[PDB]
Amino acid sequence: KLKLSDWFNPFKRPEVVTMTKWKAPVVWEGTYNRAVLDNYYAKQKITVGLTVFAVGRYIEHYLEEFLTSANKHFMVGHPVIFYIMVDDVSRMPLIELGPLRSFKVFKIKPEKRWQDISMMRMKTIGEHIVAHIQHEVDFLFCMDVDQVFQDKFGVETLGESVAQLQAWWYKADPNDFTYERRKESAAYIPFGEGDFYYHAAIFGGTPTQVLNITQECFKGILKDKKNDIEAQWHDESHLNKYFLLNKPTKILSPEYCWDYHIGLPADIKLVKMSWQT
Ligand SMILES: O=c1ccn([C@@H]2O[C@H](COP(=O)(O)OP(=O)(O)O[C@H]3O[C@H](CO)[C@H](O)[C@H](O)[C@H]3O)[C@@H](O)[C@H]2O)c(=O)[nH]1
Ligand SMILES: *[C@@H]1O[C@H](CO)[C@H](O)[C@H](O)[C@H]1O
Ligand SMILES: [Hg+2]
Ligand SMILES: [Mn+2]
């Protein structure tokens, strides 16, 4: 019993793309009513999970800043569980969590190549969804550790499957997209096809949707492997493949995952989350 016109007003931003050929909204600053959604979701006692991985140097360079900013800005006012995957828990920074946040740490086996660390996430996440995340949360987000929340990343971001507009190509055209183009990759996207180029630093949805995203992506990662090939942008190419065959129900503007090295365009009203230094 919740409708688009209840919380979303596109006309608040006519200059940017707020809707998709498939009726899915694209959230931009000013286009949303958190207050109504906060109220709507709190009634439902909704709870949101956030998985984040950090093996090796990334642990001391980013984990703490990630957790600290998430604590302060992610789904504030709703129960959230942080799922922390590390290779060495003794190096795990323990920050002080605030109201409605709790966490769980897990020790994972550290892959030799970072590219595989990043890709093996697809398999791990899936294992954890089937094991417990499926039963602990209503919505799940999977993020990259080397990020930082800047402002409120709220419930205006929930949906059945949520993708992130890659900051450097949302304004671009599809054939410029660095999709995988080698028909030998499961991640292959013809030169005619493609809707957008999604950032893999942030994807989410319901546990069931996320389990499907992650399963399909790992199968792709494995198919490509038995074929002695590696998608150019690894898991992100597979995700883009996936999000093409299965359009996302919600897409988030680059304002949610902004690269300040792109400066500060006029079409990015307020930055919720930026890439790390
Ligand atoms: O030594 C490392 C490097 C990375 N990570 C993790 O791997 C992920 C990606 O990190 P990184 O490669 O530094 O980010 P980017 O290249 O900007 O990542 C983009 O590209 C990758 C594929 O190249 C993945 O798809 C990411 O999701 C996408 O945001 C993060 O969760 C990191 O914490 C580690 O745990 N240890
Ligand atoms: C997606 O691909 C870009 C290249 O455009 C870059 O590797 C980013 O790290 C990734 O998110
Ligand atoms: Hg890396
Ligand atoms: Mn990253």
Q: Measured between alpha carbons, how far is 200 from 119 in angstroms, rounded to an integer? A: 11
CA-nearest of 248, 267, 140 to 197 is 248
Q: Measured between alpha carbons, how far is 18 from 31 in angstroms, rounded to an integer? A: 8
Alpha helices (H) along the chain: 4-7, 34-43, 58, 64-73, 114-128, 134-136, 207-226, 235-245
What sign does the dihedral 89-93-98-101 (CA atoms) show? negative
Beta strands of the chain (E only): which ranges?
A: 26-27, 48-54, 80-86, 101-107, 139-143, 147-149, 161-165, 198-205, 250-252, 273-275
**Nearest-5° Cα angle at 267, 6 to 160:** 40
Complete domains list, the chain, with CATH? 1-277 (3.90.550.10)
Q: Measured between alpha carbons, how far is 221 from 225 in angstroms, rounded to an integer? A: 6
The residue whose CA has the least distance to atom 5 of ligand 2 is 178
The residue whose CA has the least distance to atom 2 of ligand 2 is 233
CB under 6 Å to ligand 2: residues?
Answer: 166, 168, 178, 199-201, 233, 236
* Token couple for 189: 């996207």
CA-nearest of 102, 133, 120, 104 to 209 is 133
Determine if residue 66 is labeled as part of a ligand binding site. no
Determine if residue 56 is labeled as part of a ligand binding site. yes
219 Cβ contact list (under 8 Å, min separation 6): 186
238 Cβ contact list (under 8 Å, min separation 6): 122, 186, 187, 216, 217, 220, 221, 231
Pocket test for ligand 2, best of 233, 237, 241, 273 (most atoms within 8 A of CB): 233
Q: Would you call 236 a catalytic residue per the annotation?
A: yes
